[PDB]
Amino acid sequence: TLPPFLPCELQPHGLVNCNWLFLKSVPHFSAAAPRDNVTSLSLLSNRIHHLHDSDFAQLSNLQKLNLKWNCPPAGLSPMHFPCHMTIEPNTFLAVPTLEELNLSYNGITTVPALPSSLVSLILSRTNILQLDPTSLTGLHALRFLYMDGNCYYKNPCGRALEVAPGALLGLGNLTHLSLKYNNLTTVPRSLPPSLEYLLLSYNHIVTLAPEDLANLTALRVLDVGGNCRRCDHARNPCVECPHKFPQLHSDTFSHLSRLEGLVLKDSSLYQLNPRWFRGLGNLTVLDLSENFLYDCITKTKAFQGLAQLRRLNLSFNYHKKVSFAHLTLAPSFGSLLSLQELDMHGIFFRSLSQKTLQPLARLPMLQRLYLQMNFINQAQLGIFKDFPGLRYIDLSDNRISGAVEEDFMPSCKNLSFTLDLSRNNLVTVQPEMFAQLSRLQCLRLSHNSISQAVNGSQFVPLTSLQVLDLSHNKLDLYHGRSFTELPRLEALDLSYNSQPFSMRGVGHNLSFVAQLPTLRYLSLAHNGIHSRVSQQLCSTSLWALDFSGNSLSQMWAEGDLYLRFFQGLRSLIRLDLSQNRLHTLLPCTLGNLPKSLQLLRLRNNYLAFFNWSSLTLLPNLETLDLAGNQLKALSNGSLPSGTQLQRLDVSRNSIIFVVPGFFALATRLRELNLSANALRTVEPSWFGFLAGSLEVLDVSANPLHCACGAAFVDFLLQVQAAVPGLPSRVKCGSPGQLQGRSIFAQDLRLCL
DNA sequence: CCTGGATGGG
Ligand SMILES: *[C@@H]1O[C@H](CO)[C@@H](O[C@@H]2O[C@H](CO)[C@@H](O)[C@H](O)[C@H]2NC(C)=O)[C@H](O)[C@H]1NC(C)=O
Ligand SMILES: *[C@@H]1O[C@H](CO)[C@@H](O)[C@H](O)[C@H]1NC(C)=O
């Protein structure tokens, strides 16, 4: 059977996906098609500029419709093409089950007639400049209205978006409203008191007072930021907030007892008026980023009485000249008893010390601390020891330089105490730096210029440490006692550390890897390991090893010295040998890899032959990756029976032919990637029988030979369930006037 | 609100 919704793709949760197919209009699907199954239709970034009553009229259970970027207004078109979308008047009424609709980045100047089942309506970056009681009349179920971007630089209009007083009163269930980037100077008048999220940011509302939020007592989130900006570090156009502005009257927000979030970022504030935050019992999030409060936060009392607050953002409150604030936190920070996350990155200051963060020190739930990009040069890392509930500290992108004078490398997210000092200016690591941080589980020291000797002396205090990311440095040699001072180390990143000249006439000693009873994950990626090095990695504990970006080729080219170089890794699971220039492979080299291997990568090497009869020597292999190599064929022995294989990636080769039955004996094989190759066809004789047993079979980007009527078509229809993107991303290489078109296209739908 | 640090998403 043809795929039902050609040229579109059916997908989980009744999603017809028509995105990105260059469509001039909406597909009228066949009568055969299960239209009752379609609960969501997606036509993103096609070029549909005309909508008709008959378009979605037969989609009885349709609830989600996405027509975004179909007719971009002049401003938003790369080439400034004007576009105006005509919509027939019953276009949407014909869809009485419709619940959500995205009309954004389209050329419409008025709202269409919409059905009363609508619940969410997006009209962002359209040309509607007027909203009054007639626009959305009777949308009683409508909870979400978003209309951002209808009048600003990328899509201008010569005046302010008009929202008549009480335009939206009719929407008695509306709880969410977005009207950013619309060139408003005042907050509309009498918005639905049902509202819970009002976002009026990035307009030109320079004056606010209680009158403006009259009757809006259900607000839980309010964003009025960006309305009078500092424009010295953008990027795009920007009206500078004029001299004696903004003007927030002290009790502007006083009556919003239920309010949980308040955003005043980029509002040209020099002072905090504590009367703003009075009455705000339930405030959990406050965003003061991008103002001028360097001076205010050494002395302010406006945080007195914000007890429930959990996230406070102060990032980018720097002196506009680009210089240091001198910094102690006002003691009222101490009143933020519920504080969980404090953002202070990009304020710019010189010294981190006990004074600096004093009132915070004993806040009991403070967990996260963003201090990056602050150009600090004197840190006192010990101040942090007794913080009761710390877990993450971002101190990257500063100028600290000492004390005071994923399958292959897991993330530190679930871990309990983490310190990132990356992109600092450390040349050498003192052990005493880490005197007070024995509780650390993760230490990120990448992208310094660390050119020291590791010998066991460097990380002595760090006896809880499990993750040590030392990548992107110049670590000058590796010894038998390196990292042994870290008893509990579970994962170690030594990638991008290449000093082949500063070696002192010798090479790395890698025995230390044997000396680390906790170690699972190790990266030596891109270290340029050419020669002169240990002959056996041994570890009874190691689960995964990244060797990508070195020169295993060189090593195995050199006699039988390094042919057991991975053998000692008795526990191994994963091994990345990508980008090692491997031009060839001995049957003797592949038997010498740990019997336990489950995942193996060989991406981007120059292998043009590969002995599949030798996968018997890896009785546990489940995944093998040969992507981006030089294979002319899948031949020279087929896939041996018994093999446990599940994922085979041979993408980006030059496979022009496969021998019959190759994949047949691969009984467990569930994922196959033959994409980007020289395949003129696709045969079932390759899979013996067992065709519809694969779950994912990728044959896109192949010069398929669409001859009326070729033999890959029966096979692919018959297993379509496993061919991702069969309806459009599987394409003809030939003949001529089908080149680059889909194997189903208008001159092939007449030959099936 | 989320996201970054600029802006666009829901
Ligand atoms: C099969 O491999 C191909 C190419 O190796 C994959 O196609 C790429 O997909 C990645 C994302 O996973 C993108 O970075 C690229 O844009 C894609 N490139 C091309 C040319 O298509 C493909 O994803 C793999 N197949 C499957 C099902 O994952
Ligand atoms: C915003 O409104 C002002 C005042 O009427 C107008 O002069 C300006 O051009 C408008 N901005 C845009 C981007 O259309």
Ligand SMILES: *[C@@H]1O[C@H](CO)[C@@H](O)[C@H](O)[C@H]1NC(C)=O
């Ligand atoms: C590696 O480990 C130890 C240093 O702790 C040393 O005694 C041994 O000789 C080293 N091996 C090589 C081959 O350099």
